[PDB]
Amino acid sequence: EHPNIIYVFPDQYRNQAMGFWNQEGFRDKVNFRGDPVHTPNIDTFARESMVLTSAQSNCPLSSPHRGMLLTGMYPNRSGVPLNCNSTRPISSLRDDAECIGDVFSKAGYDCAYFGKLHADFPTPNDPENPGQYVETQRPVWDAYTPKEQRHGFNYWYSYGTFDEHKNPHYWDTDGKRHDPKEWSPLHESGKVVSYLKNEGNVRDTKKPFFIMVGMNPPHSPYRSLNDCEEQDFNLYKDQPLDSLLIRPNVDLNMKKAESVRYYFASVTGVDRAFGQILEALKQLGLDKNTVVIFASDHGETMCSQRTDDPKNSPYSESMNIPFLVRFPGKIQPRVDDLLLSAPDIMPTVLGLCGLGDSIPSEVQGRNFAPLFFDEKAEIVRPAGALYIQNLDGEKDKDGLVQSYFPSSRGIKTARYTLALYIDRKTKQLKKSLLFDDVNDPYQLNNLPLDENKEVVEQLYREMGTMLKEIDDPWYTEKILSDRIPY
Ligand SMILES: CC(=O)N[C@H]1[C@H](O[C@H]2[C@H](O)[C@@H](O)[C@H](O)O[C@@H]2C(=O)O)O[C@H](CO)[C@H](OS(=O)(=O)O)[C@@H]1O[C@@H]1OC(C(=O)O)=C[C@H](O)[C@H]1O
Ligand SMILES: [Ca+2]
């Protein structure tokens, strides 16, 4: 048969926010000082798994990522070019896409989704106050996902988005809303343990399972004890700011900097929650039977580059996501600088569960399962992964976004981060970031393009290839045709 799979992906979690990057072996495999975070469960897990230094969120923003995650397609084809909200009818997960849940399901898996989905355009949808939005907030951010639209998940315990961490809410398989008054991650984790124990007979123990856990923290808020457990907070409470924010690209004097205490608390708590899932696998013997992956949708600046916006930028702090894959006696624990792109996750996870031959044709990403199973595999490693920023385009008579402005395309290679920003009226180069991530890992030194013709010309060629391959708007609109060979 085919093994079980759990994909645990807390929102807004930097690859750099993991203890083990300062630990022996690991710390020699990355250019950065890891954040001073206490993540013991993940640290141990990392010594059992293939660990990437260089997984990329091509569009480091919730819905765009989730769209690539679930469909294995870039944001021009996922259905999901923008963050989902009542402003953006143009952005919602394609009904007609053959998603990760659909393939698993079609192959005999029970599939179960816990926590944040943030992939559907809000509608007056609400199962229990019908013809009504699920919240009053305008714009509307949250959404209910009916059985018709759950792409293979026969077990639902999930919201769209809602950032009260100790007052989260969930719709069950039947559309019943639940409001425990419990810190999201530890509730989500207890709820997963129950599904694993098959309490309430919610699952067929003869079928293998596919689980996704979309934890909200360590995403905003992170201002107070409303937003994390005092237990975790106690570790960072009194620590001076210059010993929490160690990245030399940080402005310690930003109103935001204080938030690091609570970010790290949410990180330590998320680790404790992941811990409960792992122990439940061991205590039930499912540990030997199950592919486990720890990931995020995008990172967090946390005052790095004075950005104030956690993400939606090409900085290593925004693009680089954790990616840890444990599959006992199929994957040797090791570190790998594979440049995995989000749309590669779905086909690679199917590869790993031996459903490589069931990858839908519409999928744009590639199946690196062979490379996970075999260090020494004749498989081509990517040269780069695309940077993508998509903004609101034009609006209609009723003030709704009905198109997207592709504000930035760029590339991350082994050595370089390049990001080109264009103007909405005159599709002309307006700002340009270029970093030598090897010599300038905190991206302090923005390199002029004119002073680097050999390097830039190569980056322009790799962007061209990739943008043409995914049939990206920059390609179809022959944007910067004058520097980018298509
Ligand atoms: C972090 C941020 O800048 N904006 C995100 C937003 O965060 C608000 C929270 O709801 C609140 O808890 C916190 O303390 O302050 C934020 C605020 O009031 O501005 O939450 C959104 C989801 O609930 C969303 O995050 S997302 O799910 O992770 O990706 C939002 O992200 C911003 O969204 C957009 C966009 O819709 O275009 C653009 C920004 O680049 C992105 O940072
Ligand atoms: Ca997010």
Numbering used by the authors: 23 to 508
The authors write:
Here we report how a core PUL has evolved to metabolise the complexity and heterogeneity of CS-A, CS-C, DS and HA. Crystal structures of the two PUL-encoded carbohydrate sulfatases provide key insights into substrate recognition by these critical, and therapeutically relevant, enzymes. The data presented here reveal how the HGM has evolved a core GAG utilisation machinery (PULCS/DS/HA) to target diverse GAGs in the human gut.
BT3349-S1_274S-sulf and BT1596-S1_92S-sulf are active on all O4 and O2 sulfated CS disaccharides, respectively. BT3349-S1_274S-sulf contains an SpII signal peptide and, due to its endo mode of action, it was hypothesised that the enzyme may be attached to the extracellular surface. An inactive form of BT3349-S1_274S-sulf was crystallised with a CS-A tetrasaccharide, but only a trisaccharide of Δ4,5UA-GalNAc4S-GlcA could be modelled. Structural comparison of HGM, marine and human carbohydrate sulfatases reveals that the linker between β-strand 4 and α-helix 5 is extended, and/or alterations of the C-terminal subdomain commonly occur in the exo sulfatases, precluding endo activity. In BT3333-S1_156S-sulf, however, occlusion of potential positive subsites is achieved by an insertion between β-strand 3 and α-helix 4. These features would also prevent extension of the sugar chain beyond the 0 subsite in the endo sulfatases. BT3349-S1_274S-sulf may enable BT4410PL33 to contribute to the degradation of CS-A and DS, where O4 sulfation would be inhibitory.
